[PDB]
Design a binder for this molecule. Structure first.
Ligand SMILES: Nc1ncnc2c1ncn2[C@@H]1O[C@H](COP(=O)(O)OP(=O)(O)O)[C@@H](O)[C@H]1O
Ligand code: BEF
Ligand SMILES: [Mg+2]
Lengths: 15, 289, 66, 605
DNA sequence: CTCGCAGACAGCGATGCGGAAGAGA
DNA sequence: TCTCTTCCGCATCGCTGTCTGCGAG
């Protein structure tokens, strides 16, 4: 049902 | 038994106070040198109190169980070097979990808060909770603000390592996790993961219900501040250019790869960089022709 | 030829900053001896320490103090 | 003032610790700063009390911080609180007591309210008070005597010097009580404005009006609510309650059109009575009960056109029972503040959402309009579903090597164009628009730089609004964006950073910005802050993207302009990279395109 | 001598006003 | 030949950043 994008959903930080 | 845990915590805390630049701390030359040779402290001048090494700051942020274990492991390694058999002390630790060297070992353990005779150093001893082998107090905000409900100077000192202390109250301390404070902590030797772990374990019960307990932005921004310092990856090496023998360049490349000396290579430009340790070996190989 | 120094690996934007410093001689000498790649560069070891703070100063300019 | 070893403010010789401090949620430092626990059982009562006596400093989810100032306490007494009531409740809530310094500070900032009053009657300004002693003390001051026109005692003053009079009266610890007794004013005829039954005000709208209308009189001051909270209905409801001639000052011709729509939607006033005073058109302002205009139109300094001069003559020679000042934060400007003296208004109601400025003139609103009557909490409205839940994100767009080569060297003010027209930033914006458009989301792209605004708009082939665009043309764009399914994304400039009511705007992308403007950042986020139709409180209905270029001054500005939003509890996620960009047909995918863009940017200078 | 104010200048962009020019009658 | 609408300069002003004198230990 129009889930949030991956970049917003989870952190994109390498650490 | 109830007093043993308080005794162990207080005795371990004063050791931690001595680790940080706290004027009020237990004074003991044997402990001071023991920490110095433990790899987490260095004096270089007996008259002046020792400072905290790069590994010293990392040791401080560790949890009490891991913090104690690391010191014990260092103690065991140094026991043989100083002349104390590891087996004798190791057996005593195993007995605790379930001679002159033993007396010296017991005295050091008492100084660490793990044991307490309570009868002017009698034969019988009562090991503490830590001898066999806590609610959080920090509220982390989305604006890089820490509100630590602390009465102890040690916890304030630990939080002050990677943050700027703004206000102090008996049951609360206002601190801000600025980039300058975090970057300074990272330069001292701390790593971001330790800071997030330090805040995570000492997390106020109000933060526990929300998942993640630490807001992602605060944890992420700390990591980015750490990653900022290492934007450039310096690596010493020796560069080879002017590879007239293009065919032999690959052969040298394969030879470098086999020896494991190659660090970086660019086939398009026909160049490679090798660590100075193996620079002589490749130079000898080229000289051999 | 054989050149001894330090290899710097950094983002392409950061590499351009290093090259700009080399061309401008802001450090008093051309610290770059041979560009290696769009991500890697080779510099003289004697000026890496001074170079490190120059990058750090750039980082401070592109950041806000709170 | 003691300082610990870690540069910390040690306040333990200052205050003791109470016994049952666990139940008490409040810390009151001698510095005036107050820290509140949002998780305490009595948080609701403490929050209501604190916001009245102290303006918030930062309100994260767990622990809020307030600061005690003279103006904040002057606002507390205005709403009805007394020094004894303030100090009693503060001590009751305080878990460490009230330090003697704060106790006397509160007393000092409360014995000055009501001593002197400013009354406007028959187009004449009089400084009235029931205590002749304070009036005589005011007369002793030179400037107070200078602005004089050339039992209860009142002396007339000249209109042009009201601001100087009000400013000095604050400095003399005798603030003027600008309160309007509309219920006992038969001189000005009552207007037929009425709040229709269909309007059911929200709890925070009712609370804000109660602070303004706590007593029979109507208090003049600033009401602060989050963008999209419904400040227009508060302004309409204030006009409905006063029932006198109302002057509404928007920020642009779009704002006055929205204000006119709000009055028609929320009030029974007929369209013939509502009038607009703008360059585009005017609905006969000579005859009108509710007048809607803009600061630029009234605040114009050069000689006006004959058509506009006739309206200005009518406005000047009129008494207004309620002057609603939308976007109050712009009033302290040199010429916008003059609008207050130009128009004779009894009650000046200020409506705003970001009571911040990059200068120190924001405090001038205290003696220009009045004390901050109310200030709602952004998170409380967010959780209650009154405003959209926005996931603020900061997209890091790595700076192109060829562009960065020029940026590191060039410093003659050409950087702003250089890093605004970053090919990587354009690709990130293009991908985000493509991704969210597929999600049936309505996107607003904000660009302070007109060159970047046009560059993105034509390249993406989307409508754009900025200075030169005519009022009719931009109003058409907004209507299409609101209703036309084909039009899903629009580009806007500094013009539309405020007062643009777009309820269905789910996404907002910011590619260019004006310095570290906290107001602009917060105001821009307000466009997508309206409550959505099928919204859910905890589902992140709206999204806010702040595209920035790494290793650039924009990074420093990005943190500066996020200060206000984080103070409201908003967390700005950092997006180093976006997944799926590689598999997307985005522009500037070749060095040839990027090289062409850099040459154009350099040529533009 | 060093360090911090601090209002003015500059950049941008936006607005109101006037004037000239094109379309309509 | 007149009148209404479009479009382009003048002038001013808002907002912010950055600066060269001024002031303080
Ligand atoms: N009590 C209410 N009932 C219904 N709709 C409301 C109410 N209050 C506000 N709204 C709607 O919310 C939006 C508020 O827009 P506006 O008043 O311009 O917001 P603000 O001035 O706070 O930025 C409009 O769509 C308005 O109709
Ligand atoms: F604060 Be709103 F957007 F008018
Ligand atoms: Mg509004």
């Amino acid at each position: 049902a129009k889930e949030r994008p991956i970049w917003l959903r989870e952190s994109t930080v390498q650490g | 038994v109830p007093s043993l845990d308080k005794y162990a915590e207080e005795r371990w805390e004063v050791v931690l106070h001595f680790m940080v630049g706290s004027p009020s701390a237990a004074v003991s030359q044997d402990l001071a040198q023991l920490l110095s040779q433990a790899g987490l402290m260095k004096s270089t001048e007996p008259g002046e109190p020792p400072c905290i090494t790069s590994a010293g700051f990392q040791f401080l942020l560790l949890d009490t169980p891991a913090q104690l274990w690391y010191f014990m492991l260092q103690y065991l390694q140094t026991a043989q070097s100083r002349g104390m058999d590891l087996v004798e002390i190791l057996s005593f630790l195993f007995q605790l979990s379930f001679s002159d060297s033993l007396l010296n070992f017991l005295q050091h353990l008492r100084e660490f808060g793990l044991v307490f005779q309570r009868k002017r150093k009698s034969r019988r001893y009562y090991p503490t909770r830590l001898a066999i082998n806590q609610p959080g107090f920090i509220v982390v905000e989305t604006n890089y603000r820490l509100y630590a409900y602390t009465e102890s100077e040690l916890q304030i000192a630990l939080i002050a390592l990677f943050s700027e202390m703004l206000y102090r109250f008996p049951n609360m301390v206002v601190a801000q996790v600025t980039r300058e404070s975090v970057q300074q902590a990272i330069a001292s030797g701390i790593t971001a993961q330790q800071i997030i772990h330090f805040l995570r374990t000492r997390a106020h019960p109000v933060m526990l219900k929300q998942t993640p307990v630490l807001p992602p932005t605060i944890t992420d921004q700390i990591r980015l501040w750490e990653l900022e310092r290492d934007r450039l990856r310096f690596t010493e090496g020796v560069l080879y250019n002017q590879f007239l023998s293009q065919v032999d360049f690959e052969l040298l490349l394969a030879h470098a790869r086999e020896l494991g000396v190659l660090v970086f290579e660019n086939s398009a430009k026909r160049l490679m960089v090798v660590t100075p340790a193996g620079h002589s070996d490749v130079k000898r190989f080229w000289k051999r022709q | 030829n054989v050149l001894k120094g330090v290899l710097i690996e950094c983002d392409p934007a950061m590499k351009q900053f290093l090259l700009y410093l080399d061309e401008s001689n802001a450090l008093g000498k051309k610290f770059i001896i041979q560009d290696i790649d769009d991500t890697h560069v080779f510099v003289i070891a004697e000026l890496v320490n001074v170079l490190q703070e120059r990058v750090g100063e750039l980082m401070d300019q592109n950041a806000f103090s709170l | 003032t003691k300082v610990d070893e870690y540069g910390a403010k040690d306040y333990r010789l200052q205050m003791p610790l109470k016994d049952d401090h666990t139940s008490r949620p409040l810390w009151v430092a001698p510095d005036g700063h107050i820290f509140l626990e949002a998780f305490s059982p009595v948080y609701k009562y403490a929050q209501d009390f604190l916001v009245a006596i102290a303006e918030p400093v930062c309100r994260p989810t767990h622990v809020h911080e307030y600061k005690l100032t003279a103006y904040s306490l002057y606002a507390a007494v205005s709403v009805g609180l007394q020094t004894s009531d303030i100090t009693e409740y503060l001590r009751k809530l305080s878990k460490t007591g009230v330090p003697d310094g704060i106790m006397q500070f509160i007393k000092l900032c409360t014995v000055s309210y009501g001593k002197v009053k400013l009354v406007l009657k028959h187009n004449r300004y009089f400084v009235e008070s029931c205590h002749p002693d304070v009036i005589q003390h005011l007369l002793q001051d030179p400037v107070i005597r200078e602005c004089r026109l050339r039992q209860t005692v009142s002396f007339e003053v000249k209109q042009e010097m009201i601001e100087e009079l009000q400013k000095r009266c604050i400095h003399l610890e005798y603030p003027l009580l600008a309160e309007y007794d509309f219920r006992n004013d038969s001189v000005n005829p009552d207007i037929n404005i009425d709040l229709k039954p269909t309007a059911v005000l929200r709890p925070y709208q009712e609370k804000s009006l109660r602070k303004m209308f706590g007593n029979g009189r109507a208090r003049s001051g600033v009401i602060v609510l989050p963008c999209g909270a419904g400040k227009s209905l508060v302004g309409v409801t204030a006009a409905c309650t006063v029932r006198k001639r109302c002057l509404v000052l928007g920020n642009s011709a779009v704002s006055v059109e929205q204000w006119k729509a709000q009055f028609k939607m929320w009030s029974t006033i007929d369209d013939s009575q509502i009038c607009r005073f703008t360059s585009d058109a005017k609905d006969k302002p000579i005859g009108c009960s509710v007048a809607i205009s803009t600061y630029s139109m009234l605040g114009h300094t050069t000689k006006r056109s004959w058509e506009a001069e006739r309206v200005m003559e009518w406005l000047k020679t009129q008494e207004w029972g309620l002057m609603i000042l939308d976007e109050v934060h712009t009033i302290p400007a040199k010429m916008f503040r003059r609008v207050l003296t130009i128009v004779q208004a009894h009650c000046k109601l200020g409506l705003t959402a970001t009571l911040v400025r990059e200068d120190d003139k924001i405090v001038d609103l205290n003696f220009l309009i009045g004390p901050k009557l109310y200030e709602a909490n952004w998170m409380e409205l967010q959780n209650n579903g009154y405003i959209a839940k926005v996931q603020c994100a900061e997209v890091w767009c790595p700076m192109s090597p060829e562009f960065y080569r020029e940026y590191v060297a060039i410093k003659t003010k050409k950087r702003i164009l250089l890093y605004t027209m970053n090919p990587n930033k354009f690709r990130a914006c293009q991908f985000l628009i493509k991704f969210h458009e597929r999600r049936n989301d309505k996107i607003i792209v904000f660009a302070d730089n007109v060159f970047a605004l046009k560059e993105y708009a034509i390249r993406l082939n989307k409508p754009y609004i900025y200075g030169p665009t005519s009022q009719g043309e931009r109003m058409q764009i907004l209507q299409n964006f609101k209703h036309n399914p084909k039009i899903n994304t629009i580009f806007i400039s500094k013009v539309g950073d405020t007062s643009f009511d777009l309820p269905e705007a789910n996404v907002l992308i910011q590619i260019s910005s004006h310095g570290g403007s906290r107001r602009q950042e917060a105001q821009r986020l307000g466009r997508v802050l309206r409550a959505k139709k099928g919204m859910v409180a905890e589902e992140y209905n709206a999204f806010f993207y702040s595209l920035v270029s790494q290793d650039t001054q924009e990074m420093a500005y990005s943190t500066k302009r996020q200060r206000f939003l984080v103070d409201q509890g908003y967390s700005f996620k950092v997006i180093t990279k976006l997944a799926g960009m590689e598999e997307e047909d985005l522009a500037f995918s070749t060095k040839e395109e990027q090289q062409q863009l850099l040459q154009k940017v350099l040529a533009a200078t």
